Scaffold this active site. Structure first.
Site, PDB file in Angstrom:
ATOM      1  N   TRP A   1       7.789  -1.247 -47.368  1.00  0.00           N
ATOM      2  CA  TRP A   1       6.607  -0.965 -48.187  1.00  0.00           C
ATOM      3  C   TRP A   1       6.432  -1.959 -49.339  1.00  0.00           C
ATOM      4  CZ3 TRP A   1      10.009   2.922 -46.561  1.00  0.00           C
ATOM      5  CH2 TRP A   1       9.482   3.779 -45.579  1.00  0.00           C
TER       6      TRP A   1
ATOM      7  N   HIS B   1       2.051   5.125 -49.156  1.00  0.00           N
ATOM      8  CA  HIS B   1       1.834   6.013 -48.019  1.00  0.00           C
ATOM      9  C   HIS B   1       1.594   7.428 -48.522  1.00  0.00           C
ATOM     10  CE1 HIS B   1       6.566   6.174 -47.762  1.00  0.00           C
ATOM     11  NE2 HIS B   1       6.107   6.478 -48.964  1.00  0.00           N
TER      12      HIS B   1
ATOM     13  N   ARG C   1      -0.807  -1.323 -50.086  1.00  0.00           N
ATOM     14  CA  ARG C   1       0.344  -2.182 -49.818  1.00  0.00           C
ATOM     15  C   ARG C   1      -0.026  -3.582 -50.291  1.00  0.00           C
ATOM     16  NH1 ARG C   1       2.729  -0.327 -45.013  1.00  0.00           N
ATOM     17  NH2 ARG C   1       2.672   1.963 -44.953  1.00  0.00           N
TER      18      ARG C   1
ATOM     19  N   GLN D   1      -4.162   6.707 -44.273  1.00  0.00           N
ATOM     20  CA  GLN D   1      -3.150   7.311 -43.417  1.00  0.00           C
ATOM     21  C   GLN D   1      -3.413   8.809 -43.333  1.00  0.00           C
ATOM     22  OE1 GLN D   1       1.113   4.880 -43.837  1.00  0.00           O
ATOM     23  NE2 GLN D   1       0.593   6.572 -45.230  1.00  0.00           N
TER      24      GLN D   1
ATOM     25  N   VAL E   1      13.342  11.003 -42.312  1.00  0.00           N
ATOM     26  CA  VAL E   1      13.471  11.816 -41.095  1.00  0.00           C
ATOM     27  C   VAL E   1      14.714  11.455 -40.270  1.00  0.00           C
ATOM     28  CG1 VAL E   1      11.008  12.364 -40.822  1.00  0.00           C
ATOM     29  CG2 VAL E   1      11.939  10.275 -39.766  1.00  0.00           C
TER      30      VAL E   1
ATOM     31  N   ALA F   1       7.497  15.884 -39.380  1.00  0.00           N
ATOM     32  CA  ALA F   1       6.478  15.188 -40.149  1.00  0.00           C
ATOM     33  C   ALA F   1       6.069  13.973 -39.350  1.00  0.00           C
ATOM     34  CB  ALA F   1       7.044  14.749 -41.508  1.00  0.00           C
TER      35      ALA F   1
HETATM   36  N1  LIG Z   1       5.082   7.067 -44.374  1.00  0.00           N
HETATM   37  C1  LIG Z   1       5.392   5.983 -43.367  1.00  0.00           C
HETATM   38  C2  LIG Z   1       5.067   6.465 -41.934  1.00  0.00           C
HETATM   39  C3  LIG Z   1       5.735   7.783 -41.596  1.00  0.00           C
HETATM   40  C4  LIG Z   1       5.193   9.002 -42.048  1.00  0.00           C
HETATM   41  C5  LIG Z   1       5.842  10.216 -41.811  1.00  0.00           C
HETATM   42  C6  LIG Z   1       7.050  10.218 -41.109  1.00  0.00           C
HETATM   43  O1  LIG Z   1       7.733  11.417 -40.892  1.00  0.00           O
HETATM   44  C7  LIG Z   1       7.606   9.016 -40.639  1.00  0.00           C
HETATM   45  C8  LIG Z   1       6.946   7.808 -40.888  1.00  0.00           C
HETATM   46  C9  LIG Z   1       4.604   4.688 -43.632  1.00  0.00           C
HETATM   47  O2  LIG Z   1       4.019   4.528 -44.738  1.00  0.00           O
HETATM   48  O3  LIG Z   1       4.594   3.858 -42.675  1.00  0.00           O
END
Ligand SMILES: N[C@@H](Cc1ccc(O)cc1)C(=O)O
Ligand SMILES: N[C@@H](Cc1ccc(O)cc1)C(=O)O
Lengths: 266, 266
Positions: A65, A94, A120, A134, A177, A230
């Site tokens: 990121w 995100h 970003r 997103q 995760v 998630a």
């Molecule tokens: N947040 C991540 C993408 C993502 C979202 C949720 C998740 O459980 C896993 C990955 C990104 O900015 O790319």
């Protein structure tokens, strides 16, 4: 007598932005599955954007990121319970931080979806933006399993590309995760796999961060005996493939000739 | 200089009918539960309105519906698969026939909700109409049980009246369900039980009628090893209690002073 084929009063005719349309479809798809849409702030704290999500400083994972760091006094960032939160300010990279905010403010079980503008530090080209959207998903509760995550995305695909659509999951890494995964959906028309987003089972340390912040706020723990999944998916990429938009840059271009082309679209 | 507090161009401002609003809320409530909305025809065949639903002729149960019988040649009534259906024509006395049409045209499992205009030969007073609306629900599939019906209505109540709302079920009779039931929801503000609608487990003879009509059409049986629940609720009664409308007659009155009062309402 009157010419009836003569143009009438030029009353204005509005329209919705492509992203508003795509986001609405996504939100509808998931509402049918019991998810509710809620939003978070675009200007976040490093705590919510990174630390609470198991993403340390000078951690290799931080590099996934490119962050816009902000400055300026007098700004009030309110936490999940309206409190005065602190920490280095930045533009959320995100929507994930929102799943931490929601959890401190509510109790399982639940299903949420959080659309949102993200930022970003990147170079703007034909298929890349510094400012995009997103859609995050979060389902927590006793007995929630990865089989359910897969079911969700299966439904997303069917809903988006028809009965002949398919989903594909492969292990991938995310500090928030474990198991972690990337998923792609089969698009029968374009005859190809579209890498849609990431996902997995909420990381133990995330639930821990949530319940610690709750206690630090006087709330009782609520995520000790539950699990959840998630996911996160980019909207522009999907909007593009779905409306046949060639340049990701048109979205924030503001060109009417462009925007006007989506008045029909529901 | 210009007076800015001066009235602007009198551009017209539209609005939606109370029933459209109430129906939309109901449809939303159930969409979140996975139900999809579909509609049937206002002019029905006795076969779909009664016979297919286990409601014989000169059956005491027929009396639960005062019917408007129609006449006239040249009218084409199309069945579920577009075919030319026959039988004495009438104005549907309820949306129930639509659950027969849907089932011959689809396969379980599924969740549908069908809003619709219905007609009963009755005397129009303060709380009674000859022309009103109903919302039918139908969920069929392997393992569907009465526990699920109750869960549905529990969710309807919570969604409509808040966390302090409650539901109540009591046995009641319908030729198309067994068990049969009437349900009421607790309305915390008005401090009283509202008798909302009927429901139950789809009657064996209904599934039988469906699969017979399918075979008579060349389709294979599809409801032999499944069960399901169905419910039906009056809209006006709910709309009234929800908007504080005193006379059921205002809905079809067409009075702007009345209609205009719901422009705000989402
Ligand atoms: N947040 C991540 C993408 C993502 C979202 C949720 C998740 O459980 C896993 C990955 C990104 O900015 O790319
Ligand atoms: N159709 C019935 C109400 C009802 C609907 C569905 C049911 O499963 C039971 C009852 C009526 O017109 O009053």
């Amino acid at each position: 007598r009157v010419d009836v084929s003569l143009p009438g009063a030029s009353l204005f005719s509005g329209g919705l932005h492509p992203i508003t349309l795509m986001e609405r479809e996504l939100v509808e798809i998931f509402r049918a599955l019991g998810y509710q849409a809620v939003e978070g702030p675009e200007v976040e704290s490093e705590f919510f954007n990174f630390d609470a999500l198991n993403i340390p400083e000078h951690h290799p994972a931080r590099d996934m990121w490119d962050t816009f760091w902000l400055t300026g006094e007098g700004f009030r960032l309110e936490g999940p319970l309206g409190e005065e939160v602190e920490g280095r300010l930045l533009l959320r990279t995100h929507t994930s931080p929102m799943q931490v905010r929601y959890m401190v403010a509510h109790t399982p079980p639940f299903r949420i979806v959080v659309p949102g503008r993200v930022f970003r530090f990147e170079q703007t080209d034909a298929t890349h933006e510094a400012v995009f959207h997103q859609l995050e998903g979060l389902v927590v509760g006793e007995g929630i399993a990865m089989a359910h995550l897969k079911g969700a995305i299966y439904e997303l695909a069917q809903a988006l590309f028809g009965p002949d659509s398919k989903v594909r999951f492969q292990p991938v890494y995310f500090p928030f995760v474990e198991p972690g995964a990337q998923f792609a959906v089969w698009w029968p028309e374009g005859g190809k796999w579209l890498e849609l987003g990431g996902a997995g089972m909420v990381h133990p340390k995330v639930f821990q961060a949530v319940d610690a912040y709750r206690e630090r706020l006087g709330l009782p723990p609520a995520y000790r005996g539950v699990t959840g999944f998630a996911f996160g998916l980019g909207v522009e990429r999907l909007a593009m493939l779905r409306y046949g938009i060639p340049d990701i840059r048109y979205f924030f271009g503001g060109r009417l000739k462009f925007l006007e082309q989506f008045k029909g679209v529901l």
